[PDB]
Amino acid sequence: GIALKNVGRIKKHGRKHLVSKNPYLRLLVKLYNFLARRTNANFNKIIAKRLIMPKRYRPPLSLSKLQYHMANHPNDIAVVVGSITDDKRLFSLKQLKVCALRFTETARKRIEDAGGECLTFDQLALKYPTGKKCVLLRGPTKARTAEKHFGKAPGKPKSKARPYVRSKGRKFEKARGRRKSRAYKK
Amino acid sequence: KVVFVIRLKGVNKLPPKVRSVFRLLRLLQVHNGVFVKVNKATKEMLKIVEPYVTYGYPTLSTVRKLLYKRGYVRVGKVRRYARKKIQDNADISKHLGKYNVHGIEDMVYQLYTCGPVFKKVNNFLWAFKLKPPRKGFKAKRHAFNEPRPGDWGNREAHINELINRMI
Amino acid sequence: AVKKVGKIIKKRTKKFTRFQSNRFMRVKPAWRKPRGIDCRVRRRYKGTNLMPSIGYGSNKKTKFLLPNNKYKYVVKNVKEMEPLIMNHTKYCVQIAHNVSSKKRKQIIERAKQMNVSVINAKARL
Amino acid sequence: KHYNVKGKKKVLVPVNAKKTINKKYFGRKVASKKKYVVQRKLRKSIEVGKVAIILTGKHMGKRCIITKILNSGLLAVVGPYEINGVPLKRVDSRYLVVTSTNIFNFENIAKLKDDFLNYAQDIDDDSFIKTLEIKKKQKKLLKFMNNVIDKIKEIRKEDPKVQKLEGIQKDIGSLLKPEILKNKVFAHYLKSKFTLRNDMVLHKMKF
RNA sequence: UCGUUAAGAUGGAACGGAUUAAGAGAGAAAACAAGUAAAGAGGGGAAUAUUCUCUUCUUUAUUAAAAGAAACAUCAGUGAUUAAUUUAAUUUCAAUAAAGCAAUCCCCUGAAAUUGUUUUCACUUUCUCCCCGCACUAAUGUGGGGAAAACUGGCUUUAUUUCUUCAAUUAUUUUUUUUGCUGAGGAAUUUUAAAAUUAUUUGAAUUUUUCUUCUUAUAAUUUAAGUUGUUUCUAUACAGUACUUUCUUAACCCACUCGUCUUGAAACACGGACCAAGGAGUCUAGCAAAUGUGCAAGUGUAUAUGAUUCUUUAAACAUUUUACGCA
RNA sequence: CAUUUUUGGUAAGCAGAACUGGCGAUGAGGGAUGCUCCUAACGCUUGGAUAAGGUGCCUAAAUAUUCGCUCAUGAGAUCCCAUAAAAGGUGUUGGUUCAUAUGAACUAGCCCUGAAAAUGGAUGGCGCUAAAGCGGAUUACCGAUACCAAGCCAUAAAAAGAAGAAAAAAUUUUUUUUUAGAAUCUUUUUAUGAGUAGAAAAUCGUGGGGUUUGUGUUGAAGCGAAAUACGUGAGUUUUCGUGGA
RNA sequence: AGCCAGAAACCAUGCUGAUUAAACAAUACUAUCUUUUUUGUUUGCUAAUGUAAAAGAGAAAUUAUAUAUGUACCGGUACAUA
Known part of the structure; x- marks a missing residue:
């Protein structure tokens, strides 16, 4: 039996092909894929990949x-x-x-x-x-509001991620662990 | 200068340091043989996996014969390799052209005696997957060194007869 | 065992009929994969009813081929002749279940004009 | 004419080439890329002066003498027609057990070697062909019964090639017979069939 | 579930898997036969409703052929066998028949007097001879005691090696006898190029050559560049007792109640007599990330109004410039 | 759960830890049998040669070779593994120290005593003693889905790609076959293929809806029995019988 | 090594069973029937087929095994022969 790391497989990630059924974009990526494979330059390949990418x-x-x-x-x-x-x-x-x-x-x-x-x-x-x-x-890339909530746990030291807050209210989510006066602070 | 190391044992129940050294060594399959540059760190690594490997000095006939009969090579891009039998020099003259080897006899020469261009050639060739010995063993789990009949560890010159037996 | 005919090799003749189907009468013979623990199928004890496996799958040149040496195409209308003429050397007609005898006879005559045999030709006569 | 790599000297015959396949997209091609098929190059045991056992023919067990090796690698053999009534038969060396024993035991037999050689020389493969017209003629009788089998034998008999072969066969038998016949013990051996019984070792047995 | 008939089976289970078998059934659609001639049944197209002409099925028989299965041969890949072989290497002989040399002597092997030596005497044979014990022995002899020699062995030679030898073990090599298994592929420019080999041609080389080497030019070929050839047979069939294939028992080898919770069930763990139907992650609210889509510093059009909107219309369409949600 | 280190407890197939490897979640070959020991991790097949392990028969290969030791009026016989000790022995076998080829003394090899239980009873059974016992050695042979070569399948990665004549049959011309360009696509190559709980994708089927273009009483659906049928598979397709919308 | 006598134990004997042996022997009578030869055995039925092993299915000293068999004398002695 041959001992194999990751069972011999390259299991790299990311988009296989355009998931949209939009005809114009499918046509456009066919063009840029064609250009990318034939042309020597990086530029076309990078454009083709970037065209494939998700909405965010x-x-x-x-x-x-x-x-x-x-x-x-x-x-x-x-x-x-x-x-x-x-x-x-x-x-x-x-x-x-x-x-x-x-x-x-x-x-x-x-x-x-x-x-x-x-x-x-x-x-x-x-x-x-x-x-x-x-x-x-x-x-x-990181302008988006979801990413403004990503990163280190709310109330855990040095953190600065936005919480998924309950509501806008004044009384909420400013007490325990968010001000030294009540329990502790981050 | 060189030492040819043949694996003998399965991949079930392997100690973790032994798994690591095997991974580096490249004796992934149970009948893998490979050439090793004699050094002290290489010898120490070899000592750690010793009960699972036989090894020795291979001789010119064996080196030539083994590369000819069982030589496969890694053809593809870096870490996108594929296992091809050699059969013509132009392929291997491509990759080892930069390091100026370009020819299977030159590969035999470097493998037989470690010279200026050994690591690359050694790495570039696919690890030798051997047959079973065509007349078996005295007893697999015992050392060649033991007074009791056995086969693992240093077999020195006599490694050649075993290689001929299992070609 | 294995069934060569020309360069059409089919690996397995015997259908993978379901685990112990005669033992419990309620069971039907078509395959159903045990989610059972200690089932003697997935826990892969030798000598039981064999699991189907993708490995038994047909060669890509053959894939769906018949000993007829022509791929079967099922026919329920006369109009289906028009692609079948161009493909006659690679495809064979089978006439569908429903087909009324007058129409069926007409299709059979058409198939002869196309120079392609019907594999169920004697039907409805 | 031959190839001599590693000293071999193979001997090449132009291959006939017959089998066509439909090819990768467009049309067809003959399968055989090569143009020359190797000559058979038979084992050294097989030789003209030797008497050999026919293993599994109709006339099997008979001791029959080799005549001509044909270009097919099939050689001709006869258990003399005067002695045994047996046809000059085509055979492979795989179906014929060649003995060490030599037809040319005596000076008289050896003096009639050239005539036998000329008779041997004339024969060819085309005389042994069934002939499709004749084969069909025999077949066309099917659509009392024993008589038709006799008629098939008559149809076989009528053929000019069969008659031509039979002439040479008769000439060889006529030539060889008196000297063979004179030594009764050798004649009896020639007549006598090969046999297997207890104490036929095979492995140590000499031929 | 139970009855009838027929077929099979049947020594304390029953069924199964894998692999063949014999029976019993089924089949011609690849699992043979294009075309040609004759006379029946149909159909079309053209020429300026009918002349010309093209066509497919039945029918009589009449030449092809191809296709698969065999079988052998031939290759290439891969094994197994049983003979070997090259020049080295390594404290390796043995005879051959003529010479010599020494007798407890010698090739040897004993036993003795940092650090080297070296010196001492101990040791062979006998189917030879003698003495005592005379047959005393395991013996076609013998126990003890002595000699003899060099046949035997040992050394030094001189020639000799197919009389007998020339081992063996490594090293690099070169072959060979039978033989087992395999044949993917399918080359509109990588089945191409070179190599190889053969017949040529030119210049060299060196171990010096009837398989000597290179490169100079020309051809063919295959060892290049993944099976091909020949001959049978099916068969001169129209479905047959053969062939395809289903069912059926057999027989060899293997084969523990399924589900289930449990680390762990063949269990003396729990559920299940049997069969049929029905029978269990859904829907709403709000939220999130994902991905699509439309627009973008805006967005949604809310309630509602409006209309040449009125089976389907319970939707669709429209909204005479700082409303509200969220950003 | 196992080796090794290990704490408590008289001990424990007991309780509690450490490191690592297994099982769990795992087939396969051996261990006579056996979840865990050993060998070894698995698509479908053909062939080879081996491993662990065997070779008296059951049961595939040796009544192999070779040297010892061994007879037991309950012998002994493969790790885990299914009992066994201190202690004896003028049974036999080697040693070693002493004394004068005999007398002592020791010594460890085998064997014996020490050595009693519950259905009938367990070297797996039969059996085995010039072993098929115990301790060696020498080979050959047999021995896996592990190992090598080859084919085919799928998965993974990589190459590469958005226009032209081949053959046969006839009698140069007639006749016969073919003549690919659909990106989740086609050609090619190499590697890979365990699996509960679990996650994903590709499928297949059922009820209804829109859409498309069909099937119907020269009998459909349905149902039983099937099919040289197709699919790895769920299934699909079809025949005969019943059947009548 | 070779032997002997020796127990309510042991095995026979005895006694009971023995469709525990899918067991068997002897005897008595009987069923258009038995025997030899030829051709056949490609409505439940009404001509009729089965073999586990043909291939030269060839082969009758005997106690033996640290010695046998004859033959001749009186189980013994002598002499041949494997």
């Missing part, structure tokens, strides 16, 4: 954040494997070249008004199949 790994990217990044890359084409959202804290645009998974209509209109460029991934594929002189972008 499809965060929105802020237009202001994209704009802030692209000012050091001033003539170059941003690609974003997520949605681009508009900003009502943002005074004006500086004119941008953006490929994204989804555009909010107000942002798209703002980009068009600015004289910028709204690229779909198929259009990007046609124009830049190599990905040369292109810039891969992605939004915040």
Whole structure:
């Protein structure tokens, strides 16, 4: 009998293929898989994987954040494997070249008004199949409110995770172990 | 300089340090044989698994014969290997081309006497899965060293006859 | 034991009839997997009724093949002739349970035009 | 003509090639990739001057002398037609027990070696073929009964190849018979059938 | 559940598994026979409702063939057998017939006088001879006591090795006798390329060659580059007593009441006479993560209003710019 | 539960710990039998050669070879394992110290005494003594689903991929077969395959609904008996009989 | 080693059973029937088939085993022969 660690198996994890029945996205991933396998570069492969990912790994990217990044890359084409959202804290645009998974209509209109460029991934594929002189972008992973509750147990030393609180009420969840006066404090 | 170590015993009921050394050694299967670079740490490791292994100095005929008749090699990417019989030099001249071996005789030469390029060649080849001995043993659970007839531990030169017996 | 016919090898003829089915009359012969403890099936004591196993599964070239050397296709309408003509060299017609004799006869005639035998041809005559 | 790797000198015959398979997608191909089939290269015990036992034919147990090795690796043998009435028969070396004993015991028999050799030389495989037309002719009689079996034997008899083979057989028998016949003990041995009984060891037995 | 008939079985269980068998049944759909000619039954298409022409089934017989199972041979893979073999290596001989050398002597082996030596005398044979005991013995002899020799053994030689030898054990090697089992695959450019081998051709090499080596050019082939060939048979069948396959007892080997709780049940642990039907993780509320979907700093459209909305309409559709929930 | 260390308790198949390995959750081969000891962990098959273990017969291979020792008027005979001691012995066998090939003294090998129980009774049974006993050694043979090679299945990983003529039959041309591009997809390769409690995926079936395109009284469903049927399987499909919506 | 006598024990004897031996022997009478030869045995029935072992299914000293068998003399002696 042969002694085997993990019974000889590679049992790596994560998405096998796109679980959605959405025709356009299934078509799109077929394209980017084709490009990824043939092309030498990492860029296409990374885009293909990122296209496959779950909804919480499809965060929105802020237009202001994209704009802030692209000012050091001033003539170059941003690609974003997520949605681009508009900003009502943002005074004006500086004119941008953006490929994204989804555009909010107000942002798209703002980009068009600015004289910028709204690229779909198929259009990007046609124009830049190599990905040369292109810039891969992605939004915040840990911004989401579920993750704000993740990490070390509430009331356990040095912890700073949000509790899954009972309700908004003043009297609730500020006593025992959350103030030194009542029992103890974290 | 070298020592050829053959496993003898099943994988049921193994002590934990012995499991670890076996895992490093690569004698996972009960009739695995493998070449080992003589060193003190290698000898000490070998001493710990001793009641479950025979070992010795293999001789040139045996080294040549064993690699020829029972040589398999790991073909795939790093840790995505696959077990292929050799049958042509160009495959093994690819992987051991960087380390400038490129040819099965060169592999025989390094295995027979440890030279500048031993670890890689040794690692690169698949561990030898041997047959049973075609005329058996006196008694499996007793040492070759014992006054009582037995077979485990150092068999020195005479390892060759056993290898010929179980090829 | 094993049943070769040409390059169609089928491993096992005997169906895996259910554990001690004659012993308790209420039991039916089709397989049912014991969730019992000490069942003498899963606890794998030799000499009892054998468990079915995926290992007995057909070779991929054969998979569902008949000794006829043609895959069986069941037919309940005349219109089913139109794919069966292009596939006749690889597929054989079986006529369905229901089929009324006038229609059935017409299908049988059609099958002869397609140059493919009906494997249950004598039926309803 | 031959291959000589490791000194072997095999002797090559062009393979006929007959079996077709439907191939990977489109159409068919013959199975045999190779073009030359190896010549049989029979064991050294088998030889022309030797008398041999026919093991399991109709005429089995008879002591029959070898004539010609055919290119099929099948050789011809006769338990002389004058002596035993037995046909010049085709046989494998696997179904024939060749003895050490030699037909050319005496100078007279050895002086008639060339005539026997010429007779031996003429025969060929094509004379031993059944013939499909003839085989069908015999078969077509099926659709009192004993008579039809006699008629089948007559149909076999009529064949020109059978007659040609029988001529050579008769010539060989006629040539060899007087010298063979003169020594009664050897004639009796030739007539006598091989037998198995108690004390037939087989393993130590000499042939 | 019970009755009738038939078939089988039957020495304190019953059934089963695995594997064959004999019986009893069933079957032709791969489990043989395309085409060709003759005369019956149908059907179509074209030419400008009927001429031309194309077709499938029955029928008579008439040439193919293929397909599988055998069997042998041939390969390649993998075994088992029984003969071996190469040049080394390792305190290894034995005769052959002529010479010599020493007799308790010698190849040997004893017993004696840090650290080396070295020296002493002890030891063979006899179917030879003698003396005492004369037949005294296990004996076709003998107990004791002595000699003799070198046949025997031992050494030194000189030649000799198929008269007899030339062991054995390692090392690297090279073969060989029978033989067992196996045959996946299927190459529209990796069944390709080189190698190998054969017949050629050119230059070299060296252990020097009728299987000597390399590389220079040309061909074929296979040891490359996962079985092929030949001959039978089924059969010149139309389902048969053969063949396929179900059922049926047998027989060899194996085979403990299932569920169950329990560390642990074949149990002297608990439940179960039997068969049929029905028979047990659901639904609501609120919450969470997951994943999909639509939109995004918004979101949902709430109650409700509205309509050229009226079997199905109990839904669907719409909502004349700071309502509310949550963010 | 076992080895080893181990505490309490007269001890305990007792209670309590330590380290590690088993069983639990586990088939298979041996241990005569046996959840745990030993060998060894398992898809389906073919062949090989071995392990633990055997080779008098039951029962597969040796009445093998080879040297000792052993006769028992209840001998003895494979770990766990199913009793056995102090103590004796002028039974026999070796030793070793003494004395004068005899007399002492010791010594340990076997054997004997020490050695009594409950159905009839247990080296597994028959039996075995020039062993088939006990202690060695020498081989051969037999011996697993473990081991090696090969095929097939599924799982896991890896390669790789989003357009063209092959054969046979006829009499150069006629006739016969084939001629793949569906991403949870096809081709290929290698590795892997235990399992209660438990988790997942792929399936198969039942009632109803929408949808699609069919089946019906030239008898369907249903039901009994089946089928050279198909599926690893649940099942599916079909025949004959009954049957009549 | 070789022997002997010796117990309410032991085994026979005795006695009881013996469809405990799927046991058997002898005798008496009987059932269109027995014997020899030929051809057949591919409505419950009304011609009729079964073998565990053919292949040359070949083979009759005897106490023996630290000696046997004859033959000749008187179980003994002598002489042959395996």
